[PDB]
Design a protein around this ligand. Structure first.
Ligand SMILES: CC(=O)N[C@H]1[C@H]([C@H](O)[C@H](O)CO)O[C@@](O[C@H]2[C@@H](O)[C@@H](CO)O[C@@H](O[C@H]3[C@H](O)[C@@H](O)[C@@H](O)O[C@@H]3CO)[C@@H]2O)(C(=O)O)C[C@@H]1O
Ligand SMILES: CC(=O)N[C@H]1[C@H]([C@H](O)[C@H](O)CO)O[C@@](O[C@H]2[C@@H](O)[C@@H](CO)O[C@@H](O[C@H]3[C@H](O)[C@@H](O)[C@@H](O)O[C@@H]3CO)[C@@H]2O)(C(=O)O)C[C@@H]1O
Lengths: 579, 558, 581
């Protein structure tokens, strides 16, 4: 013809192509007096035979492979059976004839030389269907053209989609996360298009997934099939949200549109996915990542019916990829590492409990007897611990003063650090009817350690939901900094430090307290210990590159609690500069 | 904090969605006036109950106590049940809907000093819930997608139980009674599930018969006589029930909620209640019940705020409720222990059927050639006979002047007595197009008897009556009473004027004087005192007050 | 007492028969405020078991065979499952109880002797179903009669359809045609009835073909199972319209009717067919004919719910079209005629060699490189050729200046004659993007022949879409006639004739030009080949049917008459050329 650019091209001429001569080869219904006729079909293996019209340059295999590279793979989609139907209601005291015809997507392979198409192979792939209806009287003459098409024709507007044939800081604790990135995900270039129905004005039209076969094709990518295999990811999905069926479904979706009396209507259906990510996060880095696109329940676009004789505007294909047509969603859900054993405290912790550690990382499942602030630590505050909440423990099986296991592997990090040589203790509000997981990290000592739990009825409640770092051995002048994993916005980190010198209760020293990268509100306490009381000294201290200085009593213990208000870096570096 | 010490089994209600598992089976996006229909089918694999035990309350204890009072969910989770929702996106928005399983939340609680000390929980799968939101290309609230704690989308319930440790005037024979449809067991023991249908949306509960099995419920007083198989046969005989453990019959319940009302719809499996009895001399000698799986019951309530007042209620007693309309269809059935002999010629004006020691009882199938009054009797009017009409007979195959067997075992007693030693004859209007069954009783004579049929064009008017022959002349004669407006007659010959007193004891008498023609002499006889000729007379009696199974007739001479 | 006397009769008492006693043996549903209940079933294997009530003269086998001969075959229909449902909506603040019951068609076999029915066998064939509903309160007892029927009864009006038990000129070229005679064809009586639903006022009712099985039963008649066997016809159907499935379908049809609130309604559903004819047409005659009734997607008749029973005799076996009128005539390549190919697109001139036998006919597939009028002929214009268009060709695979085979055997006759001994040439508009078939007939000459194609940018374009007969014959005065296959109304036939005598450009002869049976508009040209050839227009709107007008034409001069058929009264058009002095 006359086109543009030299070489071979794969082209999608669009959906809605009906073929010549074979209009009534499926039959039609006659409906009389106000009755509604519903005609439809079910495309499967057998009825989804495509029609190849090759050329010497472009054989069937070449046509197939190149079309399925860029566009919907119709050899796998002829597996999952899809239905459609049309519904016309005859008027009173007059008859109506409607007949059904398959629609096709018309793909082409073209050779272009000097702005001319020299060769064209065509492939018609079965899509859905089109019903045409007429009202008729006994021996009313009907136009031959109503029954019979002499040339291939698109009932929709045609398309010319071609391609030349070349031939963020995550403040997460270390561990596994399963993230729901949302629903309504389709691939580009209609690789997940179900089909299109032209719905004549006054008629009605549906596109159906009846699950006559109970099989779905999830989409799985992984960075390491050894660590994150599909089976493993499915388990994490089970752990995270309790997904059961992955390659199966009993769940039906249908889309239905009734065209008004005055105007025709068009409806396009897609298979969709719900996008999950499984990540392995370590020290600010995604060490492994899989993507699981779980077969969902579809997307449906309803447009007014476009002139079948419109201007065909040629467009180049998009890059392989996804588009979310559903709303935005991020659900981050930690999951118990299955490489890490779970030990159990069968007693609800009341005022005091001491768990003896045999001496490889592990979780400890436990609950409290009474909602309250608990201090938790190992001996000498080494190693550093982490505490997670099992998600949705509350309001199931209960027994006063005893643990009931809900068997929840979905964990919600509260506070704690992954630094086995840094001294810390935890101060957490624990809820009586929840379960919690303590995570004990890997240690290279074989010395019998012990985790200690203590109910705090005092001022240590001000450190609520915080790990407290123990800062040893400040010198009497100069700089000091302390890099740790930053909490998220509005989460907490605390630091317990003793001012240089001997305690006189009069001699002070000039301390400057600030962060380096992240913004934080700092509240400062002075510890006075008889049997911990915290005196609040300043709690309006914004820390990011602060220069403010406050004189603190020498040889006296203080605790700084910091609220992250701007997460600019994975780490939070804390400066304590002394004068 | 509640009331009363001990252990309790509790139904917290249907409509519980679980935490974390909200979008676990996908959702649809619909754009501009398009309607999305999403649905699922609860079946073996996806219908997993979730036990949350406590030391006092094991899984077994939880199961057994919940299935004692409430639905047996281990038999129900086999039969596949469907539900769907239909939401229509507006024009000026897109719409995202996602589907989630609902559960009934049962609990076992220990109560001490007006306080719950221990709670085990059991989530039994019910149906499903769709949650939808309108959106533009925007941050949606975390809470829309993700539930952190278990929650009821309906209003919750607290249904608990403390955990401890007239005259039937029927002839002797078998009856199959339809006691009606819409029978459910109590406390939702036959509940399918509940759908919340938000206003403007639509909701269905479906029985598609993806499996054909149904689970009928059977009781019997004697599994020897009335076994299940036997009862099924009687059901076949009575009403022609064919499938007992199967059905191809579909039921769906569908509601489209208005814009103004959120609607709630509860579906139950129902039963049709049949009774098979053996009735003898006013008494039910044996009785089975067959609850035939029916096509369900659908309760529509206005949807109550999910944050409503929880009113604690004690369970009802084990049993049934009829939610369908009340019904009694009594249908006699040929005793299958009793052979059926045939008169293959249509009875004309006269016919004599010859019968060959204990001559176990038997039926005789026959028809007449002309609609008319027939006198029927055995030799010397012994034994006493009964005549039944086969129900709906002879609208089918016909052959002029011959019997066609329609194979109808469903019989409708007309008249006759169950005293083989009392002399009587029958006077019945017979219809040319019907079949009738004569029932010949057990006799201890081996003497060759004969049943005689005679068309009566005149006099006999004793229509639809048995006539007792009184040979043996105070005197009393106890018989099975006819029903209100049915007849019983008495023929007596006296030593031979004389003063006769005629009255009944427990339960209108027309009196005739015989000469083969009947002259009408006299037109409440219960405890009558009226009286006033020796030498033959016939009394016809119409029961108007059925107070006793029996009618005793006094004939006192003075 | 009845009139049909002396013999045995098969009788259809109608559909809508419910049986006594067995009304609620399937159950029912209770629905409360506003809810809609839908109950239904699907007739198949076990639940489509008929109830035979025979008599000595009429056993089950006799009853079956004689009803399925005249009426629906229920043994073939009971395999393909048919569904129905009813939908009732309970009002607000009120309960509603509906129960379901099978309906039957009631057939009878009767013996009649001397105006008297002396024997009757009855057969109940399962049809669909009926739902009966009532409003109630939970406490209430409802009347026995609602739940329970003591005698067989038709819920529709009964019927008595009985039968005594014994024991247009087609202007088509020669070749095969497949004609679509249209859709919505049912057989007579109710041989194709699916069933009837009585739909209570305010309720709703559907009849469903869900294709739980795929099989369909096409209906085939043939005049010669040797020539037109079913398999052969199926091929022709494939060739004509590309029908693939004949005995199967995945295509669903359901009918739904909602009865108004005051009046009950009835809907009858039928299986329908689409009627195809395959004919072998030769010289105005259908030498062979098969009929193929392809299973379609049904017919749905909605009538008011009705009565006096009128006895009526069955119709003759046959079809009734309830769908709209349709005639689609589609020629098909005779498969007993091989296809030769011109693999290069024809330019302005091409010569295809076709040597000779004393042959079988054959086709030649070719396309042109440029849209235009082409003159096509064999050497000396013998034999006569025919040209067909392959229908819907060349919208598909394309290659510049080459033929692509689209494998289209569906052909659309343009022009040409069968008479293999009449000299002629073709003048046709050919389109660059179409394929065409030339058909070469059987000849008894062994002469090495050639077909010649020439693009005509001349006056010969006025003969567009016409065969031109050569009359070399006129050797003298007198009468002459020329019978040919008539074109259709508004199609063309042309005649090129040389007037007897030597050309002097003065001496004329008186020629009278007329047709015998068909009316035609005749345009007459004088051919002048000198410098170049022209057509000079001599006479313009001549209506030729039994014409008496005469035109003195130059002797030994060539003329061409183009004729437009306007009234097709005969298959043939006989052309008279009567010459005088
Ligand atoms: C003024 C001063 O002494 N600052 C130093 C601090 C403290 O020694 C330390 O915070 C006490 O716990 O340490 C600093 O550097 C550490 C920082 O990068 C953290 C980040 O988590 O890692 C520490 O090293 C790890 C090491 O990577 C592990 O392998 C483990 O075995 O040893 C330690 C465990 O904590 C860095 O030493 C700091 O900024 O916090 C800077 C000065 O070294
Ligand atoms: C004046 C004159 O000769 N007219 C006669 C014409 C012409 O001879 C002829 O049409 C010129 O081509 O022929 C007429 O009869 C022919 C006509 O019936 C055609 C049918 O279209 O069939 C012819 O015979 C065929 C025969 O059927 C074949 O088997 C084979 O032998 O070829 C011949 C061809 O001639 C008839 O001759 C006519 O009406 O057209 C008779 C005229 O008298």
């Amino acid at each position: 013809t006359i086109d543009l650019a030299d070489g071979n091209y794969v082209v999608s001429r669009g959906d809605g192509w009906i073929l010549s001569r074979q209009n009534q080869i499926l039959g039609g219904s006659v409906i009389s007096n106000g009755s509604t006729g519903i005609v439809g079909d079910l495309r499967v293996n057998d009825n989804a035979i495509p029609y190849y019209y090759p050329t010497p340059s472009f054989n069937e295999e070449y046509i197939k492979n190149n079309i399925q590279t860029v566009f919907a793979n119709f050899t796998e989609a002829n597996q999952i059976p899809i239905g459609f139907e049309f519904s016309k209601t005859a008027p009173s005291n007059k008859n109506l004839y409607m007949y059904l015809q398959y629609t096709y997507i018309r793909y082409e392979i073209i050779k272009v030389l000097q702005h001319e198409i020299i060769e064209r192979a065509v492939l018609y792939v079965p899509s859905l269907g089109y019903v045409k209806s007429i009202e008729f009287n006994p021996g009313e003459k009907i136009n031959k053209d109503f029954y019979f098409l002499t040339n291939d024709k698109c009932i929709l507007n045609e398309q010319f989609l071609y391609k030349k044939i070349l031939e963020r800081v995550l403040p997460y604790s270390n561990g596994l996360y399963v993230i729901n990135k949302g629903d309504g995900y389709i691939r580009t270039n209609d690789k997940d298009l179900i089909g299109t129905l032209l719905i004549e004005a006054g008629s009605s039209g549906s596109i159906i997934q009846p699950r006559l076969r109970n099989t779905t094709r999830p989409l799985f990518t992984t960075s390491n099939d050894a660590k994150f295999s599909q089976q493993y990811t499915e388990e994490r999905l089970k752990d995270a949200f309790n997904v059961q069926l992955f390659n199966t479904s009993t769940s039906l979706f249908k889309f239905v549109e009734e065209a008004p009396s005055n105007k025709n209507i068009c409806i396009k259906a897609y298979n969709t996915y719900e996008k999950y990510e499984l990540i392995d996060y370590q020290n600010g880095s995604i060490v492994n990542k899989a993507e699981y696109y779980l077969p969902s329940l579809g997307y449906c676009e309803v447009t007014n019916a476009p002139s079948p004789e419109s201007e065909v505007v040629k467009t180049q294909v998009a890059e392989d990829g996804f588009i979310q047509n559903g709303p935005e969603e991020e659900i981050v859900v930690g999951v118990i590492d299955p490489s890490e054993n779970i030990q159990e405290i069968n007693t609800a912790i009341s005022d005091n409990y001491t768990y003896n550690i045999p001496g490889n990382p592990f979780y400890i499942l436990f609950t409290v007897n009474t909602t309250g602030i608990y201090k938790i630590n190992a001996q000498n505050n080494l190693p550093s611990l982490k505490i997670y909440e099992a998600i949705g423990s509350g309001n199931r099986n209960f027994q006063s003063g005893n643990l009931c296991d809900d068997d929840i592997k979905a964990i919600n990090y509260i506070t704690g650090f992954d630094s086995p040589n840094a001294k810390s203790y935890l101060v957490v509000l624990l809820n009586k009817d929840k379960n919690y997981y303590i995570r004990v990290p890997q240690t290279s000592s074989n010395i019998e350690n012990q985790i200690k739990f203590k109910r705090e009825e005092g001022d240590l409640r001000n450190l609520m939901n915080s790990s407290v770092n123990i800062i040893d051995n400040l010198n009497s002048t100069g700089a000091h900094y302390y890099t740790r994993q930053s909490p998220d916005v509005h989460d907490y980190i605390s630091y317990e430090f003793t001012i240089p010198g001997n305690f006189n209760n009069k001699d002070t020293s000039n301390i400057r307290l600030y962060t380096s990268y992240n913004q934080g509100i700092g509240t400062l306490f002075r510890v006075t210990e008889t049997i911990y009381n915290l005196i609040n000294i300043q709690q309006n201290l914004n820390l990011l590159n602060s220069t403010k200085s406050i004189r603190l009593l020498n040889g006296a213990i203080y605790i700084l609690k910091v609220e992250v208000t701007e997460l600019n870096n994975y780490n939070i570096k804390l400066h304590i500069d002394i004068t």
